[PDB]
Amino acid sequence: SYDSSSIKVLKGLDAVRKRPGMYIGDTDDGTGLHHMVFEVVDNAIDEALAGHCKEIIVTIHADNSVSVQDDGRGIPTGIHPEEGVSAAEVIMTVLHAGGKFDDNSYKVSGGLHGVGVSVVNALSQKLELVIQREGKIHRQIYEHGVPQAPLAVTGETEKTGTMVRFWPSLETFTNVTEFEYEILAKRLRELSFLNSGVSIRLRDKRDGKEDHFHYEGGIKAFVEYLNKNKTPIHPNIFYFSTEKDGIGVEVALQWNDGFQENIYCFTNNIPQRDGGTHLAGFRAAMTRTLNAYMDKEGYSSATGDDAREGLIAVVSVKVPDPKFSSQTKDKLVSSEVKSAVEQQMNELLAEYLLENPTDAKIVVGKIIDAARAREAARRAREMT
Amino acid sequence: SYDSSSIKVLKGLDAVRKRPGMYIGDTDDGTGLHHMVFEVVDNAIDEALAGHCKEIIVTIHADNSVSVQDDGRGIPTGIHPEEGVSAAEVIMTVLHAGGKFDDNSYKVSGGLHGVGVSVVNALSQKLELVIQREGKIHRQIYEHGVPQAPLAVTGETEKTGTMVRFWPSLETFTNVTEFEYEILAKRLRELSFLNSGVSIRLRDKRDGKEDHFHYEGGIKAFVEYLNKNKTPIHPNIFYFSTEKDGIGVEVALQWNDGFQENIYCFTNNIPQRDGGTHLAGFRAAMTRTLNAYMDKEGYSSATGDDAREGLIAVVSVKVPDPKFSSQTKDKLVSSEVKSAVEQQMNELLAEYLLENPTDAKIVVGKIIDAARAREAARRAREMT
Ligand SMILES: Nc1ncnc2c1ncn2[C@@H]1O[C@H](COP(=O)(O)OP(=O)(O)NP(=O)(O)O)[C@@H](O)[C@H]1O
Ligand SMILES: Nc1ncnc2c1ncn2[C@@H]1O[C@H](COP(=O)(O)OP(=O)(O)NP(=O)(O)O)[C@@H](O)[C@H]1O
Ligand SMILES: [Cl-]
Ligand SMILES: [Cl-]
Ligand SMILES: [K+]
Ligand SMILES: [K+]
Ligand SMILES: [Mg+2]
Ligand SMILES: [Mg+2]
Ligand code: NA
Ligand code: NA
C-alpha cells in the first residue's frame, strides 16, 4: 500500500546516519573516517582565515578518538533565541545551521554549508565539546548526536578557543576504523603552507609521534617541498598573489624533469581532489600564454598536455561564496572562478616569461621535448 | 561581533537556493539545469522499477519548461498526519522526506535521499504538480518552492500517474538556460535500454521533434547500439544477469577494434559518470579472469589497461541501499557492490571464455596487441 503513511520525514541528524555517503563519503575505505577530522580542522582553519586563530592542535588519542583544539574565538555559547538552546548545540545538532551564510563572522571560509561538524557529531558514538569564551569554560557531551545535557559552564579562563573530541561510530564506519597518522599529517602540512603564521601540531598518543608544522614562504615554499624529491629544470618558481573583483588568486608553479603533472587546487584552503573551474581556468591560461610566447618568440604543434608534463603547481583561490558539488568539496563548480584564475594567470604568467628569459627558454624546450615524445609514441603505436 | 545571533538556521528549502552546488551541481554550464529534469525522470523510473509505470512522457515546452508525465501510482495525496499537509506537499517542500527510506514502496530505487524533486521545486520559479490517484485528479502550484494553495481535487479520472512541470529559476541558473533536446534524448534512450517494456517518449514543442524509445534486448542491445558506429572484433556479446546476496548484477560487454575504453556504470538505473565500487569490481574481475585464462591456455605481461582497450561495457547493479558521494550520484561509494560485481564477473566471464573459444582467442590477441603497442610507445618515448 503506497500512501501518505509511506512518506517519512527524517528529523534532526537521522538523515546523516541513514545516508552517510552524501555527507561523509566512503564509510569503508577510511576516506570518510579521516574526513571527520578534516571537517573539524576546517572549522579551526576558518578561525585562522578570519585572523583569530594562531594555533591548532590535532591529537590522535590512544582510544581511537581525535581531538582538535584551536585558539580561535570559540563557538558561540549563548542561547539562540529562535531555537531556544545554546548556539553551540544548534551548530552540533542542526543541518544547514552556522555562521558562514554571510560574510560578517568569516569574510572567507572553507565552510559554507552549515553541515560539517553536525555530520561529525551525527556519526560519532561520542563527541566532547569544550569552548573557552567570555571568560568561561563550557562543556557538553553528545552520544550519537544526542546532547546528554545542555551546554554548561565548568569554570573560568583567560583564553578563547574550541576543542572538539570525537569517537567515530562503528555502526557507520567499517573496515578502516583506525586513524592513520600520515593521512592527517599530509593535510596538516599542506594547511601550514597555506596558512603562514598558524602553528599546527599533530600528536599521536598511541606511539608518542608528533609534528609541528609552521612553514614560512607559503605556496612558493609548498612548490619547493613538492619538487624536493624531484629535479626542477629551472630555478625561478613562478608565483603571484592577487585579489581582484572580489576573488583572491594565488599561484605557484615550477617544472621538473619528470613526466607527471601535479596541480594542487584549493578553494578557501580546502583541496579539490577532482579539480573544477579553478583548474579549468589555470589550464586554459597556461595553454594560451605559453602558445602566445612561443608564437611571438618564433618557437612555434604543442597542446595543453605537453605543457602539463613535469609541472608542479599550486592554485589557491579565495572566494566569498564558492560552489562545490558535494559536502566533501572535491570539485569546485563556480564558473566565475574559472574567469578570475584564467585572467590573472594570463597577465602574470606572460610577465614572468618576459622577466625570466632563462627560465622561459628552458620551459619552451621542455614543451617541445614533450611534444616530440608524444608524437614518437603515437607513431610507434600506429606501427605495431 | 561573533555570537549566538551570528548563527543562522536555514529552513524549508532556503538551503537549496543558498547552496545549489551541493544539491544540483553546476548552475552555469547546463549540467545542473538538465539534472533538474533527470531528478523528475528518476522518480518516474522508480515507479517503473517498482512495476507500476509503463509509460513516461517528457516534454520540452515552448516556454522553456519541462514536463514529465508517468502512469505510475501517483504521489500520495492524503494528509500526512505528522506534518499536517498533503503528503505530496511534504515531498515537494521538505528535504530528506520521501518513500524510499525503506523497501516497502520501492524494493529498489534510484531515489534514496528524499531530496530530488524538492530541489527541483526549490530552484524553479514555478512548478505545476498534477496527480491522478484514487479516482481523482489533484493539482498544486508552487512558486520558488512555495505552495500557492493546498493540493486540491480538480476532477475525476480512471487513471493513475504523476505529472510534474517546472520552469527553472534564472535567479539560480545562468548561461545555459535553455533545454537541449539531445542531452535529454541520450539519457532517455539509455533508460529505455535499462528498462525493457517501458515506453519513453520525448517531445519538443519548440520544433515538433519527437522520439519514442522502446528498445528490446536490454543492456545487450545497448552494447550493440554503442558498438554500432564502431567495429566489434568478435561476434558474441558477453552478457549475464544475476541476483545474489541481495544484489543484482547485470553486465554486457564486447570489444571493438578501436582503442578507447567505454564502461557505462549504473546503480538502480542512475549513471555514475565518476564510476565507483561497481567499476572497481568490474575492472578487478576482468583483469583476474583474463590473466587466469591466458595463464591456463599458455598465452602468457599484460595489465588491466591492455584489457580496457577497445572495450565497451555496461555494468548495471540493483542495490537495496546504495551509497553515493552526492545528490547527483556521480560516484558509487558502496564497498559491498565491488565484491558482488567482482565475484559474479569472475564466475561468469570465465565460463564465457570456455564456452566461446573463437571469441576468447580474438580477445586474447587484442590484449596482446595492446600490450605490444603500449611497450612500443614507452620505448619510443624513452628514446626521444
Ligand atoms: N572551531 C570553531 N570555532 C568557532 N566557530 C566554529 C568552530 N567550529 C564551528 N563553528 C561554528 O559552527 C558553524 C557550523 O559549523 P559546521 O556545521 O561545520 O558548518 P560550516 O562550517 O558553517 N559549513 P560546512 O563545514 O561547509 O558544512 C560554523 O559556521 C561556525 O559558525
Ligand atoms: N513520479 C512519482 N510517482 C510516485 N511517487 C513519487 C514520484 N515522484 C516522487 N515520488 C515520491 O516522493 C518521494 C520524494 O521524492 P524525492 O524528493 O525525489 O526523493 P527520493 O526520490 O525519495 N530520493 P532522491 O531523489 O535520491 O533524493 C519519493 O521517495 C516518492 O515517495
Ligand atoms: Cl554567544
Ligand atoms: Cl494517500
Ligand atoms: K551545523
Ligand atoms: K523531498
Ligand atoms: Mg564546517
Ligand atoms: Mg527522487
Ligand atoms: Na560566507
Ligand atoms: Na529504499
Author numbering:
A (entry chain A), B (entry chain A): 4 to 303, 309 to 392
Original authors' sentences:
The focus of this study is the ATPase domain of Escherichia coli DNA gyrase, located in the B subunit, which functions as an ATP-operated clamp that captures the T segment prior to its passage through the G segment. The N-terminal 43 kDa fragment of the E. coli DNA gyrase B subunit comprises the ATPase and transducer domains. The latter domain participates in nucleotide binding and plays a role in signalling the nucleotide-bound status to the rest of the heterodimer. Evidence is provided for the existence of two monovalent cation-binding sites: site 1, which preferentially binds a K+ ion that interacts directly with the α-phosphate of ATP, and site 2, which preferentially binds an Na+ ion and the functional significance of which is not clear.
One of these, solved in the presence of K+, is the highest resolution structure reported so far for this domain and, in conjunction with the three other structures, reveals new insights into the function of this domain. Indeed, during refinement it became apparent that two sites occupied by water molecules could be convincingly remodelled as metal ions. Taken together, the evidence indicated that site 1 was occupied by a K+ ion. Taken together, the evidence indicated that site 2 was occupied by an Na+ ion. When the K-only model was superimposed on an anomalous difference Fourier map calculated using data collected from a similarly prepared crystal but at a longer wavelength of 1.91 Å (K-anom data), the highest peak in the map corresponded to the species present in site 1, consistent with it being a K+ ion. Nevertheless, the appearance of a minor peak in an anomalous difference Fourier map calculated using the K-anom data set suggested a minor contamination with K+ in site 2 when this is the only monovalent cation present in the crystallization and cryoprotection solutions. As a result, when K+ is bound the interaction lengths are close to the ideal value of 2.84 Å (2.81 Å on average in the K-only model) proposed for K+—O distances. If, as an approximation, we assume that the binding pocket is spherical, with a radius derived from the average interatomic distances of diametrically opposed O atoms, this value is 1.38 Å in the K-only structure, being close to the ionic radius of K+, i.e. 1.33 Å. We therefore propose that in these structures the species present in site 2 was a tightly bound Na+ ion that was not removed by the cryoprotection process. Nevertheless, the values for the N-terminal portion of the ATP-lid, including residues 94, 97 and 100 from site 1, were noticeably lower for the K-only structure, and to a lesser extent for the K+Na structure, relative to the two other structures.
